[PDB]
Structure formats: structure tokens, C-alpha cells
Amino acid sequence: YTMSLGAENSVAYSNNSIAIPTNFTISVTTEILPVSMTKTSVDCTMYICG
């Protein structure tokens, strides 16, 4: 299929109307960020030659 960018949302714009929230949601989201790698050391002489 051709991938849908998203749902269409026609904002009801006019020159004298505003939308004010009457309520709220306390939303908790996760963000995972890598920090470090495995500290690997390779003996070059021992790797090549044993």
C-alpha cells in the first residue's frame, strides 16, 4: 500500500473564534537513550599472532 501520513484534521479556523481547554491530562511518556557501550579491549599482538 501507499503509506498514510496521518489522519486529516481540518482546524476550524475563523478570525474571531478561539478554542480554550477546559480539562487536562497528566501524561507520562518514556524516552530511552543509550549512554555507554561494552568496554572491550583487544590485544592486537595476541589477536593476530596468539
Ligand X SMILES: *[C@@H]1O[C@H](CO)[C@@H](O)[C@H](O)[C@H]1NC(C)=O
Ligand Y SMILES: *[C@@H]1O[C@H](CO)[C@@H](O[C@@H]2O[C@H](CO)[C@@H](O)[C@H](O)[C@H]2NC(C)=O)[C@H](O)[C@H]1NC(C)=O
CA-CA distance, 50 to 40, in Å (whole number)?
A: 18
Burial class (CB in 10 A: 0-12, 13-18, 19+), 27: exposed
Ranges within 9-28 binding ligand X (CB under 6 A): 15-16
Which of the 8 DSSP states describes residue 40?
-
CB of 22 to ligand Y, least distance (A): 6
Residue 41 in contact with ligand Y, rule: CB under 6 A = no
As measured in angstroms, the least distance from the Cβ of 36 to ligand Y is 39
Q: In the bound complex, what is the minimum distance in angstroms from residue 14's beta carbon to ligand X?
A: 7
